[PDB]
Every structure is written in C-alpha cells, then in structure tokens.
Amino acid sequence: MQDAITAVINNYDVQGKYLDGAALDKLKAYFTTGAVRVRAAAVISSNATTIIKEAAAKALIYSDLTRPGGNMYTTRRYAACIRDMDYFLRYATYAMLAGDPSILDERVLNGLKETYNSLGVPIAATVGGIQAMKEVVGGLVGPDAAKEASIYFDYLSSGLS
Amino acid sequence: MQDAITAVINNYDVQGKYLDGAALDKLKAYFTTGAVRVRAAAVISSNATTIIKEAAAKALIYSDLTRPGGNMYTTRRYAACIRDMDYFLRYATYAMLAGDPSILDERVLNGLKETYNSLGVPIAATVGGIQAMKEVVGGLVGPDAAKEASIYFDYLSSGLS
Amino acid sequence: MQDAITAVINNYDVQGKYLDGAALDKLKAYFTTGAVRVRAAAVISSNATTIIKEAAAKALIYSDLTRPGGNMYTTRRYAACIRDMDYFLRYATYAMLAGDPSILDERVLNGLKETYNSLGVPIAATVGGIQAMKEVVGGLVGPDAAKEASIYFDYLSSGLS
Amino acid sequence: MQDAITAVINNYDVQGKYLDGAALDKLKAYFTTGAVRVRAAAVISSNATTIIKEAAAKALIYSDLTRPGGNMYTTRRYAACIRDMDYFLRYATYAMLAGDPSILDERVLNGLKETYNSLGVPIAATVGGIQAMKEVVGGLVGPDAAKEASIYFDYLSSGLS
Amino acid sequence: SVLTKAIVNADAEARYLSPGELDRIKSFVASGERRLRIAQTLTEARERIVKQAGDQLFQIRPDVVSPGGNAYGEKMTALCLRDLDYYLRLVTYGIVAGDVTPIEEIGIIGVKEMYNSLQTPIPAVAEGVRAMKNVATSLLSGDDAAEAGFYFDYLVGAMQ
Amino acid sequence: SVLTKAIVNADAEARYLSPGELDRIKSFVASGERRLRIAQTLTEARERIVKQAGDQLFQIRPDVVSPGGNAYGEKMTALCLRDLDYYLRLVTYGIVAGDVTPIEEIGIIGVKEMYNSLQTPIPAVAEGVRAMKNVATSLLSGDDAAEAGFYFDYLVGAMQ
Amino acid sequence: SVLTKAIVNADAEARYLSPGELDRIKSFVASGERRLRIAQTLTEARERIVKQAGDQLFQIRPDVVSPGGNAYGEKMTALCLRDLDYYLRLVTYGIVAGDVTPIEEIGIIGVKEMYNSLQTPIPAVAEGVRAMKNVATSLLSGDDAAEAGFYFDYLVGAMQ
Amino acid sequence: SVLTKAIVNADAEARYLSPGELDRIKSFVASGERRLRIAQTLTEARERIVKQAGDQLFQIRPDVVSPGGNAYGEKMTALCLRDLDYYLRLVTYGIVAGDVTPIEEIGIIGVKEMYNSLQTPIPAVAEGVRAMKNVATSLLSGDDAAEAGFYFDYLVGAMQ
Amino acid sequence: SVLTKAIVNADAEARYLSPGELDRIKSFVASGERRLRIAQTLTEARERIVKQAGDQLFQIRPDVVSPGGNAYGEKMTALCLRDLDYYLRLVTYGIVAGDVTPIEEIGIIGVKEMYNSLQTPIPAVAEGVRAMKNVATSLLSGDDAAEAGFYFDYLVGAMQ
Amino acid sequence: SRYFKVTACIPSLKRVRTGRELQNTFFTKLVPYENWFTEQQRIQKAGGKVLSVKLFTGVQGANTGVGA
Amino acid sequence: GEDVLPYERYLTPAGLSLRKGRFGSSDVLTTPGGITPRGDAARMMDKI
C-alpha cells in the first residue's frame, strides 16, 4: 500500500529525481491536515458500533432484506451483513488516515464485486448502506474532516458499483 | 430446453443404449398424464389475466409497494411488474406442459437474480407474488393438475430465493 | 441524466409531495444563475481549442510523456490524449449548464478508471491536464462563473483519482 | 518485557494504589535520562560491526580458539559466535533503552547456559568477549552513558557465568 | 426538462449546443418565475380542483360510481380522487419543468396496461382530467390558463 | 508502552532501532512531563471524577439502579463506583505509559467474558467511562484534556 | 512511512489504530516541516556531498581504484559516484518519510546479491556512505545532523 | 436432521453406513409419525401460544415495554411478537427434523451479534422463549410436552 | 429588555438616564453578537432539543404517558411537546433580550392557575424543562452554556 | 510474552504411520502461552501424556508484560 | 428499416450498474405489508 507521502516518493523514484518544490508542496499539504485526520479517526473508532447501527436502521432493516427470502434473512446473514459494514467502516478509516485509496484498492475492491455476484449479495443495497454510514460519519466528525472522510466512502461506493 | 420424451431420448443417446423397458416405463408414465396437463394449460391460458389480477391484489398492491418510494410506484413500473408476473405464469405453463423445469433453468432463472439486484426489484416481493399466483392456479385447475402445476411454481420460487 | 430542476422534481416525486417553499427556493436559486451559465458555456465553446492547447502546453508536453517510452508518444497517442481532453472539456460544459454532475456519472466516469488502468494511461497525468484546463477556463470565464465551472472539473478529477 | 514505566506500573498494580510522588520522581528521572540514552543507542547501532571487530581482535582471534581443535574453528562456528555477539550487543542496546533487564533475562539470559554446555562452547571466552564489547562501547559512547551501558553489559556476563 | 433535451441531443450528435438551443435555454430561464407562480397557484388550489373535478366527473359519467362501477363505494371513490390528485401533481411538475417529460415518466407510459389490469375506464379518467383542467383554468389568468391547459390537454390526449 | 512496543517491533525483525523508531522514543521522553502532570491531576481529583461519573451514569441509565438491575442496593452501587475507580487508575497508568499495553493487560482482555458472567451491562459500563471522560475534561487544559480524552476514548472503544 | 507502518500493523491485527500509534502519527506530522527543511538542504548540497564522499572513500580505500579494484577506471568510478548519488537520494527519501520502508524496498533488499554479482566491496560502499554521513552532518545543525545520521547509520547497518 | 447427521458422519471415514447407524435412524423413522403430529398440534395453536407468551413476558419484564425499552410502541411490540412467532416456527422445524441442526443455522448463529446491534435484551428474549415453552407444554400430553420442551430448553440455552 | 427597564425608572423619577444606566446599555449592546449566536444555535437545534427533552422526561416519569396520565395518547403527547417548544422559544427570546421580562409576561405569571385548571403536573413540566436545559447545554460552549442555563434555571424556579 | 518448556509423548492409535514415526511421538519444545492450551489439548485428545511443563520465560506476577 | 440509423437497444445488467449505481440505490426496499417505523418521527414533528 501507500499513503500520500510514500506515493510522492514512489512517483519521484520512478523518474529517478530528488524531491523538488512541487513535491514539497504536496508533502506540506498533507502535513497541514495531520491532526484533523487523527481526531476524526479517534472519533470514528470510539463510535464504530453506533454508526453501523444507525446506518443499518436508516438504509437496510425494515425492508425485504430482513424479511424471509431476503438476502440478510436469518441471524447468520444478518451478522455477515453487519460484519461487512464494519469492514467497510474500518477500511474507510484506514484510507482517510493514510490519505490514499491504495489500501482500498488492494484490500477491499479487488474481486469483491465478483464475490458478491457469485453470492447473490445486492451491491446496490450495500452501496446504499455505505452512503448511510458516510452520512452518519460526516455528522459525527464535523465540518473539519467531513469531506475528507466522505471522499473515501464515495471511492468505495464507486468501486463497488 | 427439453421435455420428458426428449429428455429420455437424449439420456439414452449420450450412453448410446437403445430404448429399454425402464425408459419405456418413464415414457408411458409421461403419456398417461398427457390429457390432464393439456386441460390445465388450457384453463390457465383462458384465465391468465384474472390470475395475475388476483395475485397482485393479494400480494402486491394496496401497500407501500404502490405508494411513492415503492418499486411498484409509477405506471411504468406497474406495467413492468405485471409483465413479469405474466412471464412467470407463461413459463410455468410451459414447464407444466413439458414435464421438466429445464426450460425454467434455461430461459427464466439464468441471470435473473443479478438483473433484479441491479435494477433494485424486491426479490422477496416477487417470490410472494409467484406464490400467490401458484395458489390461485392450484385453486383453478383442481387436484388433477394442482400438484404438477405447483411443483414448477415452487421451482421458480426456490431458484429466485 | 438530470439537471437541477429534474433532480428536485424526482426528489419530491419519490416522496409524493407537491412543490413546497424549499423546492421553490432551490428552483429560484438555479433560475437566478441561468444567464451566467449560458454565457460561460458560449465562451468555453468559442475558446475550446485554445484551452486544450494551453492546458497541454502547461501540463503534458515538453516532458517524458511526449518522448519515447511516454504514453502520449507517437501521433496516434497524441491525438488520442487531445481527444480525451476535448471530451472532458465538453462534458464539463454540459454539467455546468445542467447544474448537475449526473451526466458526468452516466456518460464519462463509468468504467473510465478501469479503462485507463487496462490501457496503461497515467491517471495522475490525466488529472493534471484536467486541472490545467480548469485553470485556463477559470481565467477565461471570469469571476461570475469561475467557481461554477471549476466544481465540475474538480468532480471529474476526483472521480478519476 | 517490562521497561521502567511498565515496571513501576506493575509495582503499583500488584498492591492496588494510585501513582505516588516516589513514582513521579522515578518516572521523571527516567525521562531525564532519555536523550543521552537515545544518542548512545544511535552510536552503538552505527558502530555495531566495529565493536565486534575490536572485541574479536582483543579476546578472540589469534588465540588457541581461532586454531584447529577450537570451538571457534570453522567459518560456520565463527559466524555463529559473531552472530551471538551481535545478539548480545542488540539486546544490550534494547535493555539500555528500556531501563530494565527483563529483556536481557527472558530473551537472552534465559537458557543460554545449558545450551552452551551441551554444544561445548566455552563460557569464559564468551564472557571475555562481552567485556571486550564493554570497553569498546566505553570508548565509542560518551561518558554520560558509559555506566548504564556497562551495567547491562555486565548483566549478560553475570547471567552466563 | 428543456435543458435535458438540449444537452441530450447535443451529446447525441457529439457537438456543443447550437445557438437555437441556447435561445431555448434563455427563454426557459426567463419564464421561470411565471412557471413557478402557476405551479404555486395550482399547488394551493389542489384540493378544490380535485373536489370539483370529482363532482363534474361523477355527474357526467354516473355509471362509474354505481354498483358494477370500478369506483363504486367510498374507498373506491377515495382511490379515484387520489389518482386525480396524482395527475394534478404530475401536471404541476410538468409546468415547472417546461415540457411533459416528467408527466410521461411518471404517469403515461404503461397507464393503458395498469388500468386494463385494474379494469378501470380510460375515457372516464380522461373526463376527470378534463374536469380538473376546467376547474384549474377558472382560477388562472388567460396566459397562465393557456399554459396550464397545454399540459392538461397533453394528458388527455396521451390517455387515449 | 511506547518503549516496549518499539523494542518488540525491532526485535521481531531482528534489526536495530530505525530512525523513526528512535524519534518516537525521543518525542515520548520529551513529552513525559506533561503526562506526569496529567497523572497527578487525575490522581488528586480521582474521587470527584468518580462521584460525578456515577451521578451522570445513574441519570442516563436508571435501569442499572432498579429493582431488577445489576446494581440494586448499596453494595452493588459501591462495587460499580469501585469499578469506575479501577478504570480511572488504568487510565492514569495508560497516560503515564504513553500507550495502552498495561491497560490492555490489566482491564480489557477478558472483560467481555467477565461482564457476561456477572451479567453487567457492557454499554452501561461504557456510558460510565464516557461520563468519567466528561468529568475529567473539566479539570484540565485543552491540549491536556485532549491528551486524556484519547485514552478515555480508547477505553470506550475497547469496551465495544 | 510511519503512517504505513501503523496502518499495516492495525490491519494485520484487524483493529483500529491504538492511541500510541495515533500519538506517533501526531509527532510525525509535527516534525514534517523540519524533515522537509533537512531534505531540502541535502538535495541542494547533493553534488558536494557526493564529491567529498568520493574523496574520503578513495583516500580510505585506494585499492578499489587500484588495478585489481572494482571501480578501476574513470567510468567505473563514475558508476561508483552514481551509486553514491542513488543512496543519497534514498537517504533523502527516508528522511522525508520518517522511516525506512522506501529505503528498504529501493536499495537494501537484494543489495548483497547485486553487489556480489558486480564483485564490488560492500564494506567499501559502507565506508563511502559513512563519508557521506560526515559531509552531510557538516552542513546541518546538531539535531538535524543527528536525524540525518540515523538514516545514514541505518544504511550502513543494512549493508552488512 | 438425524439422517444428515448420521450419513455424513459415516462418510468422513470412507465406509458404508454403520451397523450401529442402521438403528437410531430407525427410531427416528418410527417416531416420525408422533413428531409430525406434535408439530401439527403446535402449528395449529401458533397464535394463542405467541399471544400468551408475549403477555407473560411483558408482565415479568415490564421494563422492555416502558419508554426506555427496546420494544416501546405498538409496532416495536409487533416486531417482538413477530420474533416470538419466528422462534416458534423454528421450534416446529426442529421437532419435525428430529435435530436442532436447522434451527441452529436459521436463528441461532450470529443472534448475539444481531441483538447486540439492535440493542435488544437477550435475557428478555430468552424469557419470552421460556414463556412460549410453558404455553406450549400446557397444550400437550406429558410425553409430547417433554419432547417439545426439550427443544425449547435448547433455544433457551443457546440464547445465552 | 434592559433598555425598557432603564427608561421606565428614568421616566418614573422624571429624569434623563444616569451614567450608570448608559454604561449598562453600552455593555448590553456590546454582548449582542454572542447573544445572537446563542439564540441562533438554539433555534437551529429546535427539533432535536424538543424530541430529546420529551424522551428524557418520559423516561424519568412515564406515569404521564400512562392510561391514567394527563398526556396519554398521540394527540395528548403532541400538546406536551408543543408546550416544551413554547418554553424553548421563550428561552430564546429571553436570551436575545438579556433578561426575563418576555418570559415573565408570556409564560409564568398565571402558569400555576392554567396548569391547575388543566390538571397537569407542574412538577412534571419542570422536569421536562430541565431536560430541555440539559440537551441545550449539550450543544453549547461553556460560557454560552452557562448563559443559557441561567434562563433555564429561571424557568425551573418560576414553575415552582 | 512467555513460552512453556514442556516434554510429552503422543501415540497414534488409528492409522499406524509407517515412516520415521519417532520424532513426532516424543518431543520437548517451547510453546507460547497463548498457544499452550491448544497445544496441550491435542496430546490429551490423541491419548498421550504430558511429562512435564515449565514456566521458563515469564514471571509469576503477570499483570504488565503479559501481552505480546 | 431503411432510414433509421442503428442505435443502442439493450444493456446487460453489468453495464447498467456502471452508468447508474454509483452512490447505490437511495430508494430503500419497501415490502408490501412490512412493519416499518420510517417517517413516523417526521410526522410527529410536523403534528407538533
């Protein structure tokens, strides 16, 4: 994987160049928002279960998905769906901390679409759940890191769909 | 697709063996029940629209499905859903006539789960509608073809769910 | 696709609600800025080729991209890169006129990331070219529609990256 | 492992009262000794190979052990002894940075005598080499870290003998 | 909307917008306040229009509210008035959008199939929509009355 | 703590301390005095924080102090406030250590099984820790309050 | 970098980041401008560092520029200086990154086998790196000189 | 079921069905008639059993139907009764199958995670299942009551 | 407001405003921006504050939403929450004016008689107001929290 | 962090393995504390007996230093 | 026919989920006759 800093380092290493002024502005631009990312990550880690519960209540349950014949019918499937939501939330937090979606590409999106197609999981409903989680996280973290958190949720949704 | 007779013929052809007493017993076993299937199919074709109307009344309409926010909302989606009900009834009739769900596997259930997931259609509601249609058809045809008709509706419901 | 007006209409249609004060406020907010969008679209249309020329000269050419081993090396690849730049500019103009990035989601960004990954096109260089075009367009259109045009260029760049 | 802070934490945890003024004084003392500790560790890490070289030249090579009929004879045995020497240096640096010899006991000093007797490795020569590393670090590092470096260096020799 | 069709056909021919389409956009944005006023007026007059259209429809075609009638009984007339409310809402949406695209997507495609399944008279629903048109046009000025009557007559023609 | 974590990370790779690892230790030893001040402050205000946390918890969740609640009577409520005191002591230990190793080894690993055996509401305990954090935030400077709130939020997340 | 290390360990244990890891991230982001200034100074003085590093290496080990030497010849010495510039660039990368993952993935893993392939003295390369360490610390204040020295010593220890 | 648990067990050793397993399969097929009759008797009285069990549960644990209760409100109470009906259905499935294999996969695995996410009292749900057991055993003869209650006690133990 | 009270005393004594009154007017107008910010914040959180205040009030004493309770039923609970909304509006008015004359003239003088006539529990209403104070102070900084808490305690004392 | 130093023998009584079945039938090996229970349960399940167990690595106090 | 240009008539669901589908589905699957508390809080707020 790679964060913003390591991404800049590889981008200059491939050309065999020392760090120049523009690379300096990129690194400084990441460094300027270091504290806000850490604070929002701590907030998300402290409120992990509540975010998932509110997102599920808003977007998944009270639906066909929880009724017999639905995809998240039965306790096993309900637990699997909430586990997938927790997976998405944790990796969104990692991507937000690192300032780069490379971890999302490597550890989440690769083959998840085909696995969901084979299993019959509703990708549209999953992306709706991710969007509800994005709304709740943006509410919790505040304007400071709301957009920066929201970009990686949008990245996950676009990659899944 | 294939029917009882062609199924027996192909099953003996792929092993290269001639029509034996066993395949003969399956063949007259289909031949004995020919008239009942034809009568049930004629009754279903005669009462096609009323079956869909009663199934929709029992399972779909007069609910949140036909309200705003429901998938059945708007004339476009209402017409599409009743078209889908007609699809299921017609293919169940073909499967009952042929005595084999191979046509259901080849031309109904293939890719249907993923298509419905992509479109956002409620699969649980669709299975409920199929069950209501099965109940009405079993009422109309009578015990003579009730079980034979019901097995293919059950096959469709199990494939979808 | 959908513009601001159709977006509001669909948003109230899904709730089954007549247009109220908030929806009327949103519609008035769009209608107030109608003429500025048309003027900016006319300016961009008249200066289309010059914008691409300055953006290429500022972000792409005179580098390793146009030399041997570069992705934009050879006349076919150069023409391809400029055609892609033209497509981005044109759809940015369409999105700015419609006041909604739905057309960008439907007709440009769908599978573009995966297509560029398959072809080996540098997404970072493409984003740099898009931002150069954004700077030139902001210079041309003026303060009136500069931010309005710029938000959709930022949308395209974030969708690619 | 248990560093100084963890050791004080355990000392108060087994008795079940809060941190006291004595604990504050001990933690403040260890905080005061921090910078010189880091500098000495950096110098030792820089000159790790040189220390082993002088220690070997002073107590190990050119002697009977570096001739036929010795435990140091053969390149494999000499490499094993020098790797053990590097182990002693690295774990001594770890214990020096930690403040407590728990790492020295559990990770290094635990065992290391029954194995040596079984293998046939001389122990007096190993203790002499450990002391040789002691005078080498005594010159390499400043006098501020000399005493605390020497005490952890003598700990391994005392445990082995 | 008009913006949607202009952008759609320009994209389909793979071109920037023509000055004629820009003139359409300019006129559409200029007329926006008047369209919003008309939509507002129909919005506050939505219930009177529905009630009077229901009365006119039941007077013109009493057979629909009769024992073998599709809307016989208080609940079946409640559903009929709800459908009339739906179509008035669609007409206001069309007036705001500038053309009958929302009306088409929401209440015309498949209306024949749905009402044939429900066994409801299409000419009766068209007569109800015409009564709504009359009641609505009695509450508007002449130019606004013509502007709303265009969408109402489109609905009547499409239900056919 | 930070020192034991860095040393274990280096020992696993069988290499000496990386420059970033040394910078971490240098920063921690430089910032130790502020942590010591936090620890002494929380220690001298340990009883007021526990009392206010108990009041907030009993206001938020009356069910714990109820006829069928886990803490009904006097000795039950005494044990609950005692557990709050243990967690306050663990928070002070974590603050002085600079990491969460002692807190993890003392009071979170197996706490789920222990509280399930005792049938104590784990969300109730989390609410108590949150009230403790709110009380502790009113007796420290802003940077110092944030530093303590990091470990308080760690305990809240760990009891989840 | 430190972010990559913390995130990788948290993902490997399948948990959110610990407060100690968050504190190390905070310290790393705090030291960012200082690290950038040190790297800017080194990259500005890249050529002089390389030249006097080569002079010190040749003074210490004239055998390498001897007939049986790996770098015997002007173009062989040019290749030695080019490797020197490569390692200086890697040192700047490590200094800005705050740890040694980029330096590791670029220039130490397999360096033993590569220099065995080229028949070059690894101890001679380490001595050249030490000469670079001296020349670089000669241009920096004490704290920043020590910070660069940590990465230089890491390179020397890795080439071992 | 018993057949699945017996055949797959004699398939993990690459042997035919055991002569010890050409038994209790036998008792299962012998007692299948009684099992079907008991399941039918429970199925006929599903509404009365659910209603009385919910009544007893709401008396014994009135906190759930209070304002601070998970099942506060008419539809949250309807959901609780629906869950009780679900568990009665699973019990009938277990009775017909002769093993708790189907009920285990359908409504036990992950039930702790589901109810913790929804914030529902698992002890309250277990007590509801106990009340359902009492109401069910009130409608059956002694042997059949014991047979049904044995599965009911399995549900009570598993939800724990 | 303070202007009114100063002018009333000045006109009662038949004299121009004293320098002390002018100074308090000056400070009163100086504090206006922070007061307007507090009132704006409370106005934006109207719905949440009211809903959470109702939930806490019903948790603390559910007897008012019981069958024999004053606020039993949906349409009765709506009136109680509307009364809480009324008092929140009065508190915002008091904050903007700087003191409690609007609160007195609109919502406390005769409140005992009105609530005695309606037979509603004034102690219950006071606790409902206090819950609103808690929810409001949860959304404000400390100084603004104390400033709003002054008016909330005034209302609580007045309803007594 | 600590490893128990134990010795034990485990006989296989269902398959009669037929190549160098001696090193896997009597062994001493350091096993971690976190894995010691699952390691020791296997011997009892197979039927062998544990001859001796030793703390070796860690101290009896536990508390801090347990984690690893 | 002989005048109309060829045009796109059908899509596979995989392609259709690429054009739409970004930001998922906002509709929420509704059920006929399901028990749902959605909108009740908003209705109560408007009634108040």
Ligand SMILES: *C[C@@H](*)[C@H]1/C(=C/c2[nH]c(/C=C3N=C(/C=C4\NC(=O)C(CC)=C4C)C(C)=C\3CCC(=O)O)c(CCC(=O)O)c2C)NC(=O)[C@@H]1C
């Ligand atoms: C909100 C929940 C939605 C849902 C999900 C669902 N998922 C499964 C099963 C699996 N989910 C995964 C997921 C991942 N593998 C990965 O590598 C990652 C990222 C690192 C993820 C997120 C996998 C591998 C499986 C298959 C294994 C398993 O069955 O556990 C299921 C169960 C399906 C089944 O019963 O066969 C569900 C229900 N379902 C919904 O309806 C929600 C939208």
Ligand SMILES: *C[C@@H](*)[C@H]1/C(=C/c2[nH]c(/C=C3N=C(/C=C4\NC(=O)C(CC)=C4C)C(C)=C\3CCC(=O)O)c(CCC(=O)O)c2C)NC(=O)[C@@H]1C
């Ligand atoms: C006696 C009732 C107890 C209670 C229950 C309660 N449940 C819910 C919500 C849900 N319950 C389920 C259950 C299941 N899904 C399955 O597949 C199975 C296995 C057959 C079960 C048991 C689900 C999925 C939901 C979610 C909603 C839905 O069904 O769509 C609720 C509502 C909680 C909320 O916050 O809305 C309650 C109250 N509560 C009690 O107090 C009783 C002990």
Ligand SMILES: *[C@H](C)[C@H]1/C(=C/c2[nH]c(/C=C3N=C(/C=C4\NC(=O)C(CC)=C4C)C(C)=C\3CCC(=O)O)c(CCC(=O)O)c2C)NC(=O)[C@@H]1C
């Ligand atoms: C130019 C700034 C950059 C660049 C681009 C590049 N693109 C291609 C080839 C293709 N580009 C597309 C693009 C699209 N298809 C769509 O539907 C849309 C939106 C509506 C877009 C933008 C496609 C499909 C192709 C493949 C087919 C084709 O070649 O026409 C190339 C050619 C690659 C090749 O030679 O195979 C290039 C060079 N290259 C750069 O260096 C810039 C960063």
Ligand SMILES: *[C@H](C)[C@H]1/C(=C/c2[nH]c(/C=C3N=C(/C=C4\NC(=O)C(CC)=C4C)C(C)=C\3CCC(=O)O)c(CCC(=O)O)c2C)NC(=O)[C@@H]1C
């Ligand atoms: C000679 C062609 C090269 C060379 C060699 C050189 N060797 C030493 C010192 C030692 N060499 C050994 C060697 C071995 N020990 C073993 O067990 C084996 C395997 C049989 C070998 C080959 C040892 C142990 C020593 C140390 C002294 C001792 O034996 O006690 C030196 C001296 C180094 C010093 O610092 O004094 C030298 C120079 N030098 C060259 O230039 C040739 C390439």
Ligand SMILES: *[C@H](C)[C@H]1/C(=C/c2[nH]c(/C=C3N=C(/C=C4\NC(=O)C(CC)=C4C)C(C)=C\3CCC(=O)O)c(CCC(=O)O)c2C)NC(=O)[C@@H]1C
């Ligand atoms: C060196 C100063 C003396 C010397 C040593 C010597 N050691 C071995 C072999 C081993 N040494 C170890 C040591 C350790 N294993 C651990 O895990 C640790 C702590 C982390 C230590 C210290 C062990 C277990 C072995 C055996 C496996 C191996 O060889 O790596 C040898 C080789 C013996 C042989 O040939 O079998 C030697 C020679 N010999 C001297 O003469 C020095 C005085």
Ligand SMILES: *[C@H](C)[C@H]1/C(=C/c2[nH]c(/C=C3N=C(/C=C4\NC(=O)C(CC)=C4C)C(C)=C\3CCC(=O)O)c(CCC(=O)O)c2C)NC(=O)[C@@H]1C
């Ligand atoms: C009223 C003037 C006429 C009439 C109507 C009538 N309608 C129904 C039932 C339904 N009508 C609809 C309509 C729509 N769904 C949509 O999405 C739209 C577009 C906005 C419309 C117009 C639907 C879905 C139903 C089904 C029930 C439901 O809404 O859930 C009935 C009832 C028929 C029955 O068999 O119950 C009636 C009577 N009847 C007349 O006589 C008038 C001419």
Ligand SMILES: *[C@H](C)[C@H]1/C(=C/c2[nH]c(/C=C3N=C(/C=C4\NC(=O)C(CC)=C4C)C(C)=C\3CCC(=O)O)c(CCC(=O)O)c2C)NC(=O)[C@@H]1C
């Ligand atoms: C046969 C002449 C006698 C006899 C033997 C007997 N042995 C076992 C079990 C084991 N035998 C071995 C042997 C070896 N392991 C090795 O590594 C080697 C050399 C490479 C040998 C020879 C071991 C370790 C076992 C135990 C594990 C296993 O069963 O494979 C048994 C079985 C004991 C039991 O039931 O547990 C027997 C009977 N028995 C006689 O009566 C003869 C005198």
